[PDB]
Amino acid sequence: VDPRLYFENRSKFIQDQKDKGINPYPHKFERTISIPEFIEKYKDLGNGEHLEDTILNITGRIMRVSAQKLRFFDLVGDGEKIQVLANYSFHNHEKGNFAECYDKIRRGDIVGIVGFPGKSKKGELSIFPKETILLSACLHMLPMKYGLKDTEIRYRQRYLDLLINESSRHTFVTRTKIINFLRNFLNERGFFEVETPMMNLIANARPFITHHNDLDLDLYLRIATELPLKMLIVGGIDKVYEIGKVFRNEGIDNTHNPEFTSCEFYWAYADYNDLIKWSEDFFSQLVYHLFGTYKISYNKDGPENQPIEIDFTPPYPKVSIVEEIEKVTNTILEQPFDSNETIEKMINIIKEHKIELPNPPTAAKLLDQLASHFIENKYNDKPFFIVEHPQIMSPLAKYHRTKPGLTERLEMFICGKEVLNAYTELNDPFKQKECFKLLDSAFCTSLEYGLPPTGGLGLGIDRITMFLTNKNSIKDVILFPTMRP
Amino acid sequence: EVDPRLYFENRSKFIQDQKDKGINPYPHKFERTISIPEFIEKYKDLGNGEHLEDTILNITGRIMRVSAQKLRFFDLVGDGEKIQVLANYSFHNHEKGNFAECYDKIRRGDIVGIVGFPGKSKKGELSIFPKETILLSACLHMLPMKYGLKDTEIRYRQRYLDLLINESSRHTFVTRTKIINFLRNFLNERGFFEVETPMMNLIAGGANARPFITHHNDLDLDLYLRIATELPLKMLIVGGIDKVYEIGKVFRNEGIDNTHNPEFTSCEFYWAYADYNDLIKWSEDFFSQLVYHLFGTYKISYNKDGPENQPIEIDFTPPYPKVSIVEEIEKVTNTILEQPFDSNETIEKMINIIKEHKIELPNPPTAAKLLDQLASHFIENKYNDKPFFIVEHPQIMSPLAKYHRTKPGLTERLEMFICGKEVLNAYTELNDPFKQKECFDSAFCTSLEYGLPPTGGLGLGIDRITMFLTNKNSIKDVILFPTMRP
Numbered sequence: 001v002d003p004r005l006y007f008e009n010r011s012k013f014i015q016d017q018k019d020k021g022i023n024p025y026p027h028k029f030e031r032t033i034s035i036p037e038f039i040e041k042y043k044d045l046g047n048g049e050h051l052e053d054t055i056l057n058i059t060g061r062i063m064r065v066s067a068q069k070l071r072f073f074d075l076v077g078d079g080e081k082i083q084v085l086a087n088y089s090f091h092n093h094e095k096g097n098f099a100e101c102y103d104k105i106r107r108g109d110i111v112g113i114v115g116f117p118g119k120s121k122k123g124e125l126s127i128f129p130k131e132t133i134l135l136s137a138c139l140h141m142l143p144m145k146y147g148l149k150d151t152e153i154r155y156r157q158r159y160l161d162l163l164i165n166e167s168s169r170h171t172f173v174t175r176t177k178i179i180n181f182l183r184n185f186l187n188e189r190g191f192f193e194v195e196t197p198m199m200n201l202i203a204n205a206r207p208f209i210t211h212h213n214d215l216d217l218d219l220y221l222r223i224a225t226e227l228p229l230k231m232l233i234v235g236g237i238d239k240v241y242e243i244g245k246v247f248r249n250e251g252i253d254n255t256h257n258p259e260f261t262s263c264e265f266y267w268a269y270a271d272y273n274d275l276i277k278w279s280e281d282f283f284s285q286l287v288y289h290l291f292g293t294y295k296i297s298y299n300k301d302g303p304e305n306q307p308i309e310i311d312f313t314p315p316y317p318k319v320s321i322v323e324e325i326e327k328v329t330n331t332i333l334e335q336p337f338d339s340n341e342t343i344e345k346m347i348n349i350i351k352e353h354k355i356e357l358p359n360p361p362t363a364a365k366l367l368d369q370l371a372s373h374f375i376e377n378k379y380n381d382k383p384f385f386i387v388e389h390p391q392i393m394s395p396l397a398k399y400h401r402t403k404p405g406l407t408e409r410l411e412m413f414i415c416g417k418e419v420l421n422a423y424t425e426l427n428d429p430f431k432q433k434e435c436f437k438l439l440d441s442a443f444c445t446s447l448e449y450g451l452p453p454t455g456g457l458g459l460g461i462d463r464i465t466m467f468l469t470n471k472n473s474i475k476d477v478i479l480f481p482t483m484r485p
Numbered sequence: 486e487v488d489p490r491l492y493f494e495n496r497s498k499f500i501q502d503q504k505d506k507g508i509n510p511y512p513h514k515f516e517r518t519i520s521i522p523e524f525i526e527k528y529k530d531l532g533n534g535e536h537l538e539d540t541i542l543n544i545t546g547r548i549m550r551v552s553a554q555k556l557r558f559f560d561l562v563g564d565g566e567k568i569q570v571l572a573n574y575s576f577h578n579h580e581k582g583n584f585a586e587c588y589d590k591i592r593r594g595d596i597v598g599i600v601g602f603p604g605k606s607k608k609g610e611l612s613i614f615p616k617e618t619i620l621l622s623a624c625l626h627m628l629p630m631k632y633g634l635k636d637t638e639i640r641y642r643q644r645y646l647d648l649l650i651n652e653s654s655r656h657t658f659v660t661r662t663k664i665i666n667f668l669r670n671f672l673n674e675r676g677f678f679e680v681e682t683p684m685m686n687l688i689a690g691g692a693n694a695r696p697f698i699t700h701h702n703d704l705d706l707d708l709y710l711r712i713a714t715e716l717p718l719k720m721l722i723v724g725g726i727d728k729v730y731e732i733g734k735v736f737r738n739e740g741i742d743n744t745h746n747p748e749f750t751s752c753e754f755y756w757a758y759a760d761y762n763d764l765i766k767w768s769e770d771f772f773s774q775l776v777y778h779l780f781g782t783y784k785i786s787y788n789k790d791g792p793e794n795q796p797i798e799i800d801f802t803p804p805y806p807k808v809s810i811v812e813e814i815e816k817v818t819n820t821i822l823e824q825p826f827d828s829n830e831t832i833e834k835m836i837n838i839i840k841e842h843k844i845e846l847p848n849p850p851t852a853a854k855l856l857d858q859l860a861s862h863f864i865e866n867k868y869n870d871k872p873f874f875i876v877e878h879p880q881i882m883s884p885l886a887k888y889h890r891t892k893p894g895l896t897e898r899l900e901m902f903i904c905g906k907e908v909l910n911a912y913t914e915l916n917d918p919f920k921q922k923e924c925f926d927s928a929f930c931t932s933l934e935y936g937l938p939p940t941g942g943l944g945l946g947i948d949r950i951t952m953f954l955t956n957k958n959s960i961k962d963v964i965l966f967p968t969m970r971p
């Protein structure tokens with residue numbers, strides 16, 4: 001019962017049985033059935049009923065072991081479990097002696113089993129092996145039920161987590177049918193999945209640097225998928241999307257990972273109205289798809305504290321950033337914008353409310369600060385859009401038709417943090433401040449080639465999974481989060 | 486022929502002159518009744534010269550051709566198909582603007598919204614008759630012709646041109662997407678579980694390929710881009726996901742050629758309680774069913790040589806030939822290599838073989854890479870008419886694969902080849918920690934200590950397969966934005 005000594009004992013076990021000719025790691029075991037299939041077929045039987053003349057070969061890992069004439073194990077696989085009832089009478093003795101063969105089995109051992117299904121004495125569904133073979137041996141003591149969490153090796157060694165905690169398994173299953181539902185959701189609308197370079201010549205933001213040796217160029221990992229997708233829009237693909245890894249060099253956080261999965265799509269002849277309805281539809285239908293209801297409960301502060309219900313029933317509240325800033329601070333900010341006096345105006349708003357006064361105090365920064373202290377968590381109760389950002393804050397999104405100095409842009413916040421960001425792209429090459437005379441330039445040139453009016457959108461899939469799987473950290477919804485050794 | 490530069494200038498001037506008149510050359514929203522392929526489908530079979538004059542639609546498109554009175558013709562393309570735009574003076578709504586100038590404004594490459602009614606030309610091909618046509622997004626360049634692209638840098642560098650003009654290219658990439666979709670669904674239907682793995686590992690590259698190196702500054706940690714998805718996936722098999730797979734980008738740093746590029750999409754899966762016979766049936770089934778899915782037949786024509794040159798026909802009808810590598814080498818060279826293997830005598834023997842026969846190039850002389858080289862010359866190009874397996878590689882050549890049951894010094898391993906190129910790689914994983922050579926990465930060797938079931942695993946170059954199914958001699962053709970020096 002000292003895990004190092006246990007490890008040593010089991011290693012020695014392995015070799016002295018290899019010495020007897022028995023191989024503890026056999027090459028192949030033909031599998032007739034899987035534990036869930038097993039359950040589904042045989043779940044309805046009488047209590048104490050055996051069916052002894054259909055012989056099955058089933059496999060799994062032994063997660064519970066209990067002990068002359070009988071042995072009970074708990075065999076698990078595919079996140080589900082059946083009991084293993086070994087009877088002396090049914091055992092095929094010529095394969096090996098009963099005692100010796102079933103004494104070799106320890107918890108965590110992966111075994112093949114030849115036997116017949118039936119339910120137990122009072123009829124818990126079980127398989128009765130005529131013989132039990134060791135497919136792979138576990139050399140370590142598996143941590144017990146609550147042995148992990150806090151742990152945090154759980155991120156380092158994930159397999160242990162997936163074995164012991166069901167919640168993580170369930171979490172990841174959920175993650176991939178979130179992505180599944182997203183991909184299908186898009187595909188059904190005629191969207192087109194593509195792959196875009198992860199190493200680009202030009203990369204404004206905080207990148208990684210990598211180097212190709214023989215091409216002898218230093219390249220940067222992508223901060224987003226946007227530009228080449230828009231170039232694809234220019235190319236005749238008018239509905240296009242990509243689900244892929246994106247990279248940023250900034251610091252790690254609860255909600256931040258250097259490596260995060262994003263879904264960015266571009267949609268021709270659509271503006272942020274169709275994008276908003278797209279968001280409402282997607283999130284509503286997704287939440288209903290998972291939970292059979294639009295209402296979910298999410299624990300923001302710990303598990304130990306009162307959750308908050310989040311209602312994904314559409315439509316979601318839309319808040320003009322500037323307007324409600326102007327209403328709450330009760331000053332008329334602008335007329336637009338960065339503009340000297342208004343700067344000063346904004347700055348004083350920042351000081352009296354004892355907010356950060358971020359430096360350098362340019363206008364965009366001040367607007368971001370103001371907008372987030374005031375607006376960003378205004379509504380927790382459900383996802384809400386922050387709309388019509390100033391176009392000093394958004395030198396991509398096209399100018400708002402009616403409201404000048406603003407953009408057509410929407411940013412969807414769930415539970416105080418950013419999830420979705422979508423805007424109508426600016427297709428006028430003369431109105432893009434970014435294109436300079438003497439890559440990104442390929443996008444500007446493609447822009448000279450007449451990109452149609454198009455709305456774009458991008459997603460937080462890691463964070464979305466966080467909220468839908470009810471987790472407070474991004475590392476819980478990621479299989480192997482990046483960590484320092 | 487006109488000069489491109491001042492054409493560009495001319496319509497830039499056009500654009501802001503149009504802005505000076507209050508007109509917006511880049512409108513915010515055009516709302517669309519119908520998309521061109523839907524248009525096509527609905528109205529194809531209208532009688533010649535038939536006209537639905539009560540039905541008014543708003544349709545968008547890009548102008549790819551223009552004819553010069555009171556009558557105008559265009560080719561409106563979108564979503565891969567084409568309708569003609571018949572602008573009749575008598576039909577055109579004059580209240581919005583003058584016919585002449587409104588339609589003298591439109592020139593090739595422009596993206597226009599069109600409000601008008603469907604019909605068919607008296608000559609009998611489908612047409613949209615605008616009562617009104619508005620400019621959505623203007624194109625400032627002449628655009629090239631079917632001459633313009635292939636063969637060219639800008640076919641790759643400016644991709645949108647390739648997709649617009651060539652009309653072959655986007656069929657290619659559609660195909661790539663249908664390949665990958667078909668693969669994902671193919672795996673999903675078998676109870677496989679898609680996952681996402683780190684693209685950045687502390688693990689370096691591998692003996693075969695140099696690593697891409699990057700650095701995370703705040704953790705002050707040197708990270709290496711993944712050369713394969715294998716290790717975390719196998720760790721997931723330890724974790725209780727018995728059928729797992731990932732389709733994603735994979736990074737190798739070696740040189741660039743037609744069949745190789747540094748950043749390529751691969752698909753790798755791991756299958757518990759499966760041995761490679763399951764894997765070969767899997768390979769044969771995937772490829773057979775796939776080729777039939779796309780082409781309606783099991784045989785496809787690929788040009789091993791250039792387009793001018795005679796294409797060979799490849800037959801994907803299973804089962805495919807299995808060729809034991811060492812034994813085949815022995816049979817063709819008519820020398821008995823081994824018994825095993827890296828024997829100084831045997832290494833010498835192999836060298837003598839390569840130089841004496843082929844004058845094929847010796848290399849830094851590892852026994853493994855020797856075997857690989859002789860294999861490369863002799864066996865690989867044997868079958869170009871059918872996809873074929875090179876099977877049972879010696880374990881010196883394959884550290885990860887499990888030992889062959891009945892044959893010493895060999896592994897249970899397959900490698901599938903199309904036209905002499907390496908498409909698919911699979912083997913039965915070696916789950917014994919003590920048998921394992923590396924354990925004498927650490928996280929994987931430790932994963933084995935909690936036990937890993939008998940598993941088998943496979944990986945797919947997607948880009949190459951896409952080449953062979955889309956008939957391309959270079960991988961740069963099936964990758965949307967290939968990497969090139971500017």
Ligand SMILES: C[C@H]1CCC[C@H](C[C@H]2Cc3cc(O)cc(O)c3C(=O)O2)O1
Binds near residue numbers: 460
């Ligand atoms: C592509 C964008 C669109 C807006 C929401 C979301 C923002 C994104 C920012 C971001 C930055 C970072 O360094 C690490 C991360 O995990 C994230 C994230 O998940 O959310 O995804």
Ligand SMILES: C[C@H]1CCC[C@H](C[C@H]2Cc3cc(O)cc(O)c3C(=O)O2)O1
Binds near residue numbers: 907910944948
């Ligand atoms: C995952 C693997 C399995 C075997 C086929 C294929 C091999 C791979 C080799 C390879 C190496 C390299 O440095 C650059 C490349 O573009 C490729 C490739 O396309 O195919 O994919």
